Write a protein that binds this ligand. Structure first.
Ligand SMILES: *[C@@H]1O[C@H](CO)[C@@H](O[C@@H]2O[C@H](CO)[C@@H](O)[C@H](O)[C@H]2NC(C)=O)[C@H](O)[C@H]1NC(C)=O
Ligand SMILES: CC(C)CCC[C@@H](C)[C@H]1CC[C@H]2[C@@H]3CC=C4C[C@@H](O)CC[C@]4(C)[C@H]3CC[C@]12C
Ligand SMILES: *[C@@H]1O[C@H](CO)[C@@H](O)[C@H](O)[C@H]1NC(C)=O
Ligand SMILES: [K+]
Ligand SMILES: [K+]
Ligand SMILES: [K+]
Ligand SMILES: [Mg+2]
Lengths: 268, 992, 39
């Protein structure tokens, strides 16, 4: 033929069949032992998610949400993702004492449901009403963005203490139980309005620590609705929403490390 | 074009002096007119040689920039700029990826260009050396007056004059001469002075006395002649053009390189476009379809391989430089290993090029002297009183002297003023009797008759050094038979005795044997003149026989020859044991050529020519079956009337071939004949008459000390110490580097698979990219470099000089067996070890292997800063990318770890590491430096930006260890099978 | 610890780099030693 005879062509096939078969069987074996060394409830390493990311619902083309108020299908793209998220926070999804629980309607302290063990059933998560998100189809004019803190197993988000000076200096400082979120731009051509649990501009600490998908399915993380009823129009406004805390940090590279990058433009 | 120049020349030495003048419109006495000479100048053109048109270095450099790998790397470099252009227009990408990768790849092409350019070097100044043989000026007779003119202004027809010490300015017809002798070594390779006279003495113009040639010099006397040829039209000017004009051609090693380039280029374009369409079918945007292709290019092309080859060659050439063997062309480092036929000059190559005493006949006994340079033999006789009598004649009846200031150099190497035979005798006595000058001071010469054409003897009368005599001793030497007709007694073991027919017959026997050995034989005799008949003041007349020259006492015979170099016989046998055919090709006479052939082992004992059979059986040569003769001796005059097909039959039908009295073109023809049969041929030589053959040879080797400038220009290799044993070393080195290149190539190729497979699974699996493009270049250009080079220092696995020369048609540098092992077996194991570490990194950070399938869409989505892992955690864009790049880093390090084992297995093709050992210190160096480089690239701060290399946790380093070990075991088991059964299965499938 | 389990999300990449570079250097020196056993 090309290389060899039929007899040789066969033998080279019988070899590579057994050979690659063995190699596949060995590869799988090493994957088995790897998995055997891992927990079902907690990942081996968590230093790469460490400082929590802050992500929002409006799917930004490039950290930007520009549209026209005087146009219907101009914002119907951002309403798709906005709906996708809030559709999960339905009351019909949170039914019965299992696996949900009514928690303080005001920001409270942490809740420990034991260890990362299966020695108990599904760890009961705090309910969250999308109805706590006042004012927010969504904002056809002047968007109503929804913030979110990235989930990390066993992470206890710790707010800053009012020992020294603060950006939003001491205003509504629920020091003990709220992780604040203050959006900014100089360039003050807007109108910041925050909505959340208990009416506070933060995340209620009663939703922590997260026990993971395996130990807490259907779990709901707290949301923080933000509305920009800015009196300006037809210009790119670089708005940055920042979260503050002891366990919260940022990076010049990762522009989502505990903060937002939104470029709103109501070009109408 | 040069087929005309490969033919024997035609001449006009047969014409009379007068007749020759009519042909050139010339005067025998007055010479040309100033006006007629200038007319002929403009007519024929200058008496000069024009160098052939060369290829500029520009085109030579750029021709390498387009050879398979460079072509693919160019397509990659441009395709980078393509994707970059498409980006800069569509979505403003502030990145530098495609732009920088395009710059990097273009640089890789340029630098790789320098390496191949360095390897494909051609240092040739043939025509320049020939031009150096034309004198600046010549002496001509114009308008009846002699004047010096620019030799280029010399034309056919003018009257030229030459004298001892000057170069022949052009081909001349001798019309007048006085004691003129010439050095024709340019045409023959033999430096013994040849007389020139107006008389025609041979039909063959290269042998007649009435022609003098350009490229030669007058050694003594004076001559006048008419110019018959000028410039390019001279006999050796044509040889110049032939030699300088010959197409170089591709080396065996070069052909091998291009061959695997085709193979690897083939699989590259195959998988390249095979997966380019496979991606579009899967619905991949052309934006991405090209990005994957660039990666495929980089994965398939072994970026550092061609440069490795060059370095391995260079390092092999450095070792040979250290044995006095200079390599002018890097590729010639290997040709000697692939050589199946050596065509060797005799004089100054196989031989020392110096008349040396070989045997002596005295006391009715043949004695042998030591002919070797360094005198590696033993003594023959010292005791016999006869010896001292013969020794005295050899010293006394000798007019040769050592040049001043030689006392530092060895006797046999020092320059001597005199003819070759007298120098030989001088050096013979000086060696075994001490200072000859002393013997010539103790015995003052009073009268002598120098060797005469008519007398055929030379005699001398000396004052006997003996005090009790202080009388007159007569000594003489000459033609053995002439000396015999002048002897009455023979000095036997001390005492004289009558010359009976018995001893006279033993003389003839001794004389015939020595002459049969191709040796020049001389007779020696002396006579103690009677005291009473010769007073202490008796005057001797040299002009008229004033003393007896008959009834003298015969002392002995001495024989001499230009002997082989000490190492030559043994080197010839070694070449022949390695299955290399050795042919002699010489300008010298057949009797001498044949005798040295037997001396060095070109013609082995018992082997006969058709002429030998005929003489032994006493029958006509036509009655001899030529197939009964494995040896042959072909004279150039017969070679001339043979067609190439008939030359091919001679080459095919004889194992032991001697081509004697060959011209320079004839040497070229013999070389081409050998090549025509498909053989790789080496030429060894030292003369300008070797230049065409040396050029045409697959590898020409010139002698460094004895070699002429031309020969060393025409060669690929120079033996700087004239050590012929270096050929044996060269062939051995050549074979070793050929095997080691295979090892180094397999090693380099093996790591291509773990660079290809990640890109494929990226498409078919939709998982995060396991390894990056930049990461690949860190391997092929970084870590694999020193290890790959180090394989050039591997010792032989067996006695390589015991095997036959490779068949260049069947035995390839890269074959299917190499690809099967490197791509199908070992590289495949490396790929898995890479993937394993990849799955380990991701799974330990929260992305278990199961959830990875079909996630790249969301993984690469820059706007999703919340991807969910297996444990329900959310990752931003840059966070997961850090883990991904950490995966690139550990996959990279996994390659390094699996290349550890590969380096050790590529060490040997057959033998076990437990047999070959770990005595390669460069290899071990490679292991340490490779690992140091990898660690540095991972842990050095800032490398995460420039190369996207991230720090690895200690446990990460050990992921591929079980795969590294399986490689070592697998290959060790496999080679154990090879050795345990030379049959073929494992052998014919995987044996590189 | 409980709410004070910050060490769980931390890794000393600084020490690892220091050690990694020490090792790389020493492997580089060791290599020179073995190579220079004859040049
Ligand atoms: C989650 O809540 C949303 C609230 O808008 C539900 O949307 C409803 O969709 C139905 C049918 O398309 C409409 O008739 C209603 O007007 C919507 N709102 C309400 C309050 O009922 C959505 O269907 C819910 N999703 C799930 C899975 O239950
Ligand atoms: C990533 C995976 C799926 C690709 C696997 C590719 C396999 C099938 C390839 C890789 C190397 C290949 C072999 C390389 C060498 C030879 C020897 C030659 O004389 C005949 C073909 C043969 C035997 C090839 C057959 C196919 C082969 C085994
Ligand atoms: C939000 O909606 C409420 C009614 O639910 C209305 O009273 C109020 O004006 C709205 N706020 C703004 C800022 O438009
Ligand atoms: K490669
Ligand atoms: K050559
Ligand atoms: K490679
Ligand atoms: Mg010679």
């Amino acid at each position: 033929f090309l290389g060899r005879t039929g007899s040789s062509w066969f033998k080279i096939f019988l070899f590579y069949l057994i050979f690659y078969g063995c190699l596949a069987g060995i590869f799988i074996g090493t994957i088995q032992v790897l998995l055997l060394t891992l927990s079902d409830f907690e990942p081996k390493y968590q230093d790469r998610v460490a400082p929590p990311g802050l992500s929002h619902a409006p799917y930004a083309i490039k950290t930007e949400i520009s549209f026209s108020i005087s146009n219907p299908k101009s914002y119907e793209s951002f309403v798709k993702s906005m709906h996708k998220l809030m559709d999960l926070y339905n009351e019909s999804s949170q039914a019965g004492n299992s696996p949900f629980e009514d928690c303080s309607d005001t920001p409270a302290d942490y809740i420990k449901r034991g260890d990362l063990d299966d020695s108990q059933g599904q760890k009961k998560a705090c309910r969250f009403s999308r109805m706590w998100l006042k004012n927010c189809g969504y904002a056809e004019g002047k968007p109503c963005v929804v913030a979110k803190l990235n989930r990390i197993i066993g992470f206890y988000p710790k707010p800053l203490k009012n020992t020294t000076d603060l950006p939003e200096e001491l205003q509504a400082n629920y020091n003990q139980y709220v992780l604040p979120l203050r959006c900014a731009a100089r360039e003050k051509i807007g109108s910041i309005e925050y909505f959340g649990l208990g009416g506070y501009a933060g995340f209620p600490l009663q939703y922590y620590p997260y026990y993971g998908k395996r130990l807490q399915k259907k779990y709901l993380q707290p949301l923080l609705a933000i509305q920009f009823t800015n009196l300006t129009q037809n210009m790119e406004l670089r708005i940055e929403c920042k979260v503050y805390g002891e366990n919260i940090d940022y990076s010049e590279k990762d522009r989502f490390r505990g903060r937002f990058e939104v470029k709103i433009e109501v070009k109408s | 074009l040069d087929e005309l120049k490969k033919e024997v020349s035609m001449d006009d030495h047969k014409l009379s002096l007068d007749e020759l003048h009519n042909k050139y419109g010339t005067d025998l006495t007055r010479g040309l007119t100033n006006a007629r000479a200038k007319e002929i100048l403009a007519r024929d053109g200058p008496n000069s040689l024009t160098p052939p048109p060369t290829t500029p270095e520009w085109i030579k450099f750029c021709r390498q920039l387009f050879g398979g790998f460079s072509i693919l790397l160019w397509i990659g470099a441009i395709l980078c700029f393509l994707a970059y252009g498409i980006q800069a227009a569509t979505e403003d990408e502030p990145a530098n990826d495609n732009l920088y990768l395009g710059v990097v790849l273009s640089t890789v092409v340029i630098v790789t260009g320098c390496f191949s350019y360095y390897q494909e070097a051609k240092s040739s100044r043939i025509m320049d050396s020939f031009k150096n043989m034309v004198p600046q000026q010549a002496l001509v007779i114009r308008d009846g007056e002699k004047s010096t003119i620019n030799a280029e202004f010399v034309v056919a027809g003018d009257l030229v004059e030459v004298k001892g010490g000057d170069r022949i300015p052009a081909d001349l017809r001798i019309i007048s001469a006085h004691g003129c002798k010439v050095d024709n070594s340019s045409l023959t390779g033999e430096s013994e002075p040849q007389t020139r006279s107006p008389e025609f003495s041979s039909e063959n113009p290269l042998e007649t006395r009435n022609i003098a040639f350009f490229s030669t010099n007058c050694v003594e006397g004076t001559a006048r002649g008419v110019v018959v040829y000028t410039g390019d039209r001279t006999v050796m000017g044509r040889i110049a053009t032939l030699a300088s004009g010959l197409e170089v051609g591709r080396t065996p090693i070069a052909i091998e390189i291009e061959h695997f380039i085709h193979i690897i280029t083939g699989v590259a374009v195959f998988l390249g476009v095979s997966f380019f369409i496979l991606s579009l079918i899967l619905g991949y945007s052309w934006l991405e379809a090209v990005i994957f292709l660039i990666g495929i290019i980089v994965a398939n092309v072994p970026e550092g391989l061609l440069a490795t080859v060059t370095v391995c060659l260079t390092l092999t050439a450095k070792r040979m430089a250290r044995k006095n063997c200079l390599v002018k062309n890097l590729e010639a480092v290997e040709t000697l290993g692939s050589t199946s036929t050596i065509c060797s000059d005799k004089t100054g190559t196989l031989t020392q090029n110096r008349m040396t005493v070989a045997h002596m006949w005295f006391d009715n006994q043949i004695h042998e002297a030591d002919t070797t340079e360094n005198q590696s033999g033993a003594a023959f006789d010292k005791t016999s009183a006869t010896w001292s009598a013969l020794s005295r004649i050899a010293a006394l009846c000798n007019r040769a002297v050592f040049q001043a200031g030689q006392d530092n150099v060895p006797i046999l190497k020092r320059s001597v003023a005199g003819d070759a035979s007298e120098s030989a005798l001088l050096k013979c006595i000086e060696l075994c009797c001490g200072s000859v000058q002393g013997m010539r001071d103790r015995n003052p010469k009073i009268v002598e008759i120098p060797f005469n054409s008519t007398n055929k003897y030379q005699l001398s009368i000396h004052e006997n050094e003996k005090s009790s005599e202080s009388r007159y001793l007569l000594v003489m030497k000459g033609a053995p038979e002439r000396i015999l007709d002048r002897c009455s007694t023979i000095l036997l073991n001390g005492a004289e005795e009558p010359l009976k027919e018995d001893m006279k017959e033993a003389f003839q026997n001794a004389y015939l044997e020595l002459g049969g050995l191709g040796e020049r034989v001389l007779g020696f005799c002396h006579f103690a003149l009677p005291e009473d008949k010769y007073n202490e003041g008796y005057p001797f007349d040299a002009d008229e026989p004033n003393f007896p020259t008959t009834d003298l006492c015969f002392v002995g015979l001495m024989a001499m020859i230009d002997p082989p170099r000490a190492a030559v016989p043994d080197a010839v046998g070694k070449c022949r044991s390695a299955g290399i055919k050795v042919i002699m090709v010489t300008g010298d006479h057949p009797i001498t050529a044949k005798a040295i052939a037997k001396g060095v082992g070109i013609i082995s004992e018992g082997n006969e020519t058709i002429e030998d059979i005929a003489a032994r059986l006493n029958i006509p040569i036509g009655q001899v079956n030529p197939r009964d003769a494995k040896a042959c001796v072909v004279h150039g005059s017969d070679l001339k009337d043979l067609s190439t097909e008939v030359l091919d039959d001679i080459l095919h039908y004889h194992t032991e071939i001697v081509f004697a009295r060959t011209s320079p073109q004839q040497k070229l023809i013999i070389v081409e004949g050998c090549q025509r049969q498909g053989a790789i041929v080496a030429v060894t030589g030292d003369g300008v008459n070797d230049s065409p053959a040396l050029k045409k040879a697959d590898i020409g080797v010139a002698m460094g000390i004895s070699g002429s400038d031309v020969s060393k220009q025409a060669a690929d290799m120079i033996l700087l110490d004239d050590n012929f044993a270096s050929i044996v070393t060269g062939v051995e080195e050549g074979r070793l580097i050929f095997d080691n290149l295979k090892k180094s190539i397999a090693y380099t190729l093996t790591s291509n698979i773990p660079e290809i497979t990640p890109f494929l699974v990226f498409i078919i699996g939709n998982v995060p990219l396991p390894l990056g493009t930049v990461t690949i270049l860190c391997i092929d250009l970084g870590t694999d470099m020193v290890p790959a080079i180090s394989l050039a220092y591997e010792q032989a696995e067996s006695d390589i000089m015991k095997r036959q020369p490779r068949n260049p048609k069947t035995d390839k540098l890269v074959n299917e067996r190499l690809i099967s092992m490197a791509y199908g077996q070992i590289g495949m194991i490396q790929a898995l070890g890479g993937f394993f570490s990849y799955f380990v990194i991701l799974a330990e950070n929260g992305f278990l292997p199961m959830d990875l399938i079909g996630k790249r869409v969301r993984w690469d989505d820059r706007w999703i800063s919340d991807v969910e892992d297996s444990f329900g955690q959310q990752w931003t864009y840059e966070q997961r990318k850090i883990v991904e790049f950490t995966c690139h880093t550990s996959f990279f390090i996994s390659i390094v770890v699996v290349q550890w084992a590969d380096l050790i297995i590529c060490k040997t093709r057959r033998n076990s590491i437990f047999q070959q050992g770990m005595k390669n210190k460069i290899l071990i160096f490679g292991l340490f430096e490779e690992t140091a480089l990898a660690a540095f690239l991972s842990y050095c701060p800032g490398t995460d930006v420039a190369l996207r290399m991230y720090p690895l946790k200690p446990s990460w380093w050990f992921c591929a260890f079980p795969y590294s070990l399986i490689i070592f075991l697998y290959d060790e088991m496999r080679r154990f099978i090879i050795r345990r059964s030379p049959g073929g299965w494992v052998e014919q499938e995987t044996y590189y | 610890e409980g709410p004070d389990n910050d060490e769980r999300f931390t890794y000393d990449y600084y020490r690892l780099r220091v050690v990694g570079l020490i090792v790389a250097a020493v492997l580089c020196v060791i290599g020179i030693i073995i190579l220079l056993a004859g040049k």
